[PDB]
Design a protein around this motif. Sequence first.
Motif, PDB file in Angstrom:
ATOM      1  N   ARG A 146      -0.460   7.081   6.447  1.00  0.00           N
ATOM      2  CA  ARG A 146       0.147   5.762   6.593  1.00  0.00           C
ATOM      3  C   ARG A 146       1.640   5.902   6.891  1.00  0.00           C
ATOM      4  NH1 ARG A 146      -1.739   1.094   4.894  1.00  0.00           N
ATOM      5  NH2 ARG A 146      -3.176   2.082   3.356  1.00  0.00           N
ATOM      6  N   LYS A 174       0.848  -1.187   0.000  1.00  0.00           N
ATOM      7  CA  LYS A 174       0.000   0.000   0.000  1.00  0.00           C
ATOM      8  C   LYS A 174       0.890   1.247   0.000  1.00  0.00           C
ATOM      9  CE  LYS A 174      -3.845  -2.367   2.300  1.00  0.00           C
ATOM     10  NZ  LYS A 174      -5.022  -2.261   3.240  1.00  0.00           N
ATOM     11  N   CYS A 194       4.575  -0.724   6.547  1.00  0.00           N
ATOM     12  CA  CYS A 194       3.469  -0.004   7.165  1.00  0.00           C
ATOM     13  C   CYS A 194       3.341  -0.661   8.551  1.00  0.00           C
ATOM     14  CB  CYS A 194       2.178  -0.184   6.369  1.00  0.00           C
ATOM     15  SG  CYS A 194       1.356  -1.768   6.643  1.00  0.00           S
TER      16      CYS A 194
END
Length: 61
Positions: free
Chosen positions: A19, A13, A32
């Motif tokens: 994030r 992602k 992450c």
Amino acid sequence: KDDEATHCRQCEKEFSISRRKHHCRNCGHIFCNTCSSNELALPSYPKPVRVCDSCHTLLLQ
Ligand SMILES: [Zn+2]
Ligand SMILES: [Zn+2]
């Protein structure tokens, strides 16, 4: 030891203000938070450190 990542090495992602970026103390890649939710004792370090799921599995065997 690593910098300048764009996506989480694991889930891929995209990193953004929403994030946060994190380092796996075992392989140095940027992940992450969800992909690096485990801490374990790692030789070079004094206290348990954060690691990605892959490295987590690798070191629990
Ligand atoms: Zn991820
Ligand atoms: Zn790792």
